[PDB]
Amino acid sequence: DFSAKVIQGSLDSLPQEVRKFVEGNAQLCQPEYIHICDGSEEEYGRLLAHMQEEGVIRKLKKYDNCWLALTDPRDVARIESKTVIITQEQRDTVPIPKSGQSQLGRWMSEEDFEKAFNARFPGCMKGRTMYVIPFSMGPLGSPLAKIGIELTDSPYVVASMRIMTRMGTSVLEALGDGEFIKCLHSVGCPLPLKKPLVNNWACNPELTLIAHLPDRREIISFGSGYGGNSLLGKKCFALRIASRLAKEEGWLAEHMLILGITNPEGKKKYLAAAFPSACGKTNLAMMNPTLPGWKVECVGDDIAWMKFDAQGNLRAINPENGFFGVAPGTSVKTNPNAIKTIQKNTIFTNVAETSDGGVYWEGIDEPLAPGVTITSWKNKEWRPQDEEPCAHPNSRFCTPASQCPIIDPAWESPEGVPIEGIIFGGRRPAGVPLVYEALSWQHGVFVGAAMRSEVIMRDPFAMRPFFGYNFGKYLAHWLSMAHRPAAKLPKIFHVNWFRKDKNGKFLWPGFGENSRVLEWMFGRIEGEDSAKLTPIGYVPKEDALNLKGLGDVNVEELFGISKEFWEKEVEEIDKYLEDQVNADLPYEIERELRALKQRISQM
Numbered sequence: 352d353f354s355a356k357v358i359q360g361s362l363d364s365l366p367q368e369v370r371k372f373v374e375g376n377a378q379l380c381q382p383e384y385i386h387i388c389d390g391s392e393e394e395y396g397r398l399l400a401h402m403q404e405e406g407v408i409r410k411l412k413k414y415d416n417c418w419l420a421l422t423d424p425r426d427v428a429r430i431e432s433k434t435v436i437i438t439q440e441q442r443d444t445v446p447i448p449k450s451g452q453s454q455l456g457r458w459m460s461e462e463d464f465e466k467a468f469n470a471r472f473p474g475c476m477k478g479r480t481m482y483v484i485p486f487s488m489g490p491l492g493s494p495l496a497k498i499g500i501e502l503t504d505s506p507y508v509v510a511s512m513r514i515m516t517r518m519g520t521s522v523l524e525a526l527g528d529g530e531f532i533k534c535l536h537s538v539g540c541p542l543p544l545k546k547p548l549v550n551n552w553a554c555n556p557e558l559t560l561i562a563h564l565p566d567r568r569e570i571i572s573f574g575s576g577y578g579g580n581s582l583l584g585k586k587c588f589a590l591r592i593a594s595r596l597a598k599e600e601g602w603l604a605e606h607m608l609i610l611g612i613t614n615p616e617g618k619k620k621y622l623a624a625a626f627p628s629a630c631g632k633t634n635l636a637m638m639n640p641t642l643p644g645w646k647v648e649c650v651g652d653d654i655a656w657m658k659f660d661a662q663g664n665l666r667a668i669n670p671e672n673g674f675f676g677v678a679p680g681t682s683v684k685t686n687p688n689a690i691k692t693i694q695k696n697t698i699f700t701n702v703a704e705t706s707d708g709g710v711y712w713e714g715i716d717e718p719l720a721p722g723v724t725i726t727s728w729k730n731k732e733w734r735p736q737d738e739e740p741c742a743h744p745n746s747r748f749c750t751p752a753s754q755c756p757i758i759d760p761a762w763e764s765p766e767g768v769p770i771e772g773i774i775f776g777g778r779r780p781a782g783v784p785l786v787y788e789a790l791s792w793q794h795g796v797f798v799g800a801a802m803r804s805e806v807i808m809r810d811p812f813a814m815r816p817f818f819g820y821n822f823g824k825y826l827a828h829w830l831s832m833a834h835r836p837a838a839k840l841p842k843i844f845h846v847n848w849f850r851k852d853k854n855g856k857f858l859w860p861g862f863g864e865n866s867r868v869l870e871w872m873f874g875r876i877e878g879e880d881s882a883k884l885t886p887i888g889y890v891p892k893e894d895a896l897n898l899k900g901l902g903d904v905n906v907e908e909l910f911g912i913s914k915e916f917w918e919k920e921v922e923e924i925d926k927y928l929e930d931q932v933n934a935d936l937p938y939e940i941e942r943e944l945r946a947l948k949q950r951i952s953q954m
């Protein structure tokens with residue numbers, strides 16, 4: 352009985368299974384106190400102030416209630432080498448590669464994990480508060496939503512989870528005796544500290560391990576206080592656990608923005624888009640369109656949970672409550688709506704600070720007044736002419752979604768938004784045109800499976816680091832949507848903002864100008880005759896894209912399709928799928944590969 356150590360809420364108030372989860376891990380981790388979070392403003396503000404007292408965060412006095420965390424440089428991002436999924440059989444988690452090393456996930460046996468767990472968690476919260484975070488992934492009481500309980504010894508995690516999820520007492524009441532995902536996190540630094548504390552940032556790099564146990568409905572993360580490793584809703588639940596739940600239950604959990612686009616006529620559609628990290632989902636999701644009369648509105652910028660309803664519409668919710676966005680590169684011109692969203696109630700991690708209490712980073716495109724100096728993310732003075740950057744490259748802001756000036760009116764609708772188009776894309780300097788459309792659902796699944804991005808690494812569906820289970824079975828799951836009764840299969844497109852000429856400059860300007868590409872997609876969904884058939888799919892007809900105001904864009908280079916390039920491309924796709932997917936590659940994906948190779952051979 353840990354009732355004596357409860358400093359907020361009550362163990363008697365908890366659902367029975369939530370109580371078991373809290374007490375079992377209180378016995379294991381031996382926290383000094385147990386704090387059951389209520390999600391209130393008072394809790395949040397007080398916890399922020401406490402972190403301020405401790406040197407854990409700094410207040411940014413230029414803004415309304417904004418904050419800055421600088422981490423230990425050993426704990427700066429997700430670490431894929433220490434990210435694992437536990438299942439009885441390896442094959443259910445990853446396909447058995449021919450070459451012996453999988454790029455599609457990392458399996459650990461139950462036996463090996465149990466040893467690793469026992470070497471980490473016993474007594475790991477000594478002298479710290481265990482916070483109990485009840486949270487909803489998705490709008491409260493949406494039929495597509497799912498509930499988690501996160502245990503953590505990090506106030507930074509509590510504050511960040513309040514922004515990125517719906518958390519507090521209302522979630523506990525909505526949960527009742529229903530099922531939930533068990534999320535256990537520790538920074539791995541029990542008191543008294545055995546090792547030195549760097550930058551007031553508790554972490555344990557040597558023992559860092561982020562584990563997923565889909566069959567036990569558990570996420571167990573040790574040693575890292577950062578982002579995807581500690582905010583257990585962000586990737587661990589949102590993609591890895593949820594993709595497995597999605598496979599079991601007949602839905603999809605994807606690394607996709609959701610946006611609503613409205614033409615000059617006022618006709619509206621919703622699109623989903625899967626790009627890898629560093630390929631601009633957040634820019635597109637809250638785009639300021641350069642084309643007159645067009646309006647883009649944001650539903651989400653990172654995670655899409657999608658399920659075909661009884662009418663056959665692909666319904667998507669954003670399961671997040673905020674944007675955990677990359678800070679460097681974000682400017683007034685690249686993303687004006689992000690700049691507006693993050694002005695208040697926002698936590699920044701690993702960015703630079705200006706002498707007047709403002710935030711700064713590479714590519715911010717806001718010159719400072721003379722006299723204004725900059726402190727870097729490493730807490731040292733920094734001039735533009737210095738070699739190292741002022742902000743870490745994967746530094747982040749964590750901001751409420753409700754503050755976005757163009758947040759979609761249906762962004763919290765419990766039924767979700769009807770998706771009519773799915774877009775894939777990444778960074779390809781050569782060969783791949785600006786935009787094309789898949790010839791069918793089966794081709795579209797192949798296009799997702801074939802995705803690559805800048806060293807050009809493969810990233811099928813932008814999910815390479817996030818697959819909850821066997822990628823081959825994931826492909827089969829996607830393909831099975833075509834045999835679902837009444838399913839209205841969205842049109843699939845592939846984009847490339849990053850094609851370059853032989854001098855290495857971008858052939859397309861991008862950003863708000865990408866609204867010109869979205870227009871074409873909109874029309875194609877409407878059934879307009881604006882498409883020319885090519886070996887790789889439908890591209891826009893000559894003069895079908897609005898290029899007014901761009902001057903002379905080199906269209907023939909931008910839309911050029913080379914036999915020699917695509918020959919090499921199909922061969923490389925073949926070898927990858929053969930190696931990495933092998934016996935689990937669906938028949939239909941092999942067929943699309945064979946078909947594309949054949950169409951290219953006839954060029």
Ligand SMILES: Nc1nc2c(ncn2[C@@H]2O[C@H](COP(=O)(O)OP(=O)(O)OP(=O)(O)O)[C@@H](O)[C@H]2O)c(=O)[nH]1
Pocket residue numbers: 626627628629630631632633634635652653675676677679680685848849857860861862865
């Ligand atoms: N050239 C060009 N670059 C772009 C465009 N859109 C975004 N970018 C670049 O993409 C980067 C920002 O994208 P990120 O925010 O890292 O991508 P994301 O998909 O949101 O990544 P996660 O948040 O990690 O999922 C910056 O380097 C931008 O300059 C575009 O239209 N053209």
Ligand SMILES: [Mn+2]
Pocket residue numbers: 405
């Ligand atoms: Mn103290």
Ligand SMILES: [Mn+2]
Pocket residue numbers: 632633652653675676677
């Ligand atoms: Mn993003």
Ligand SMILES: [Mn+2]
Pocket residue numbers: 606628653
């Ligand atoms: Mn992401």
Ligand code: NA
Pocket residue numbers: 406407408420421422550551552
């Ligand atoms: Na710090």
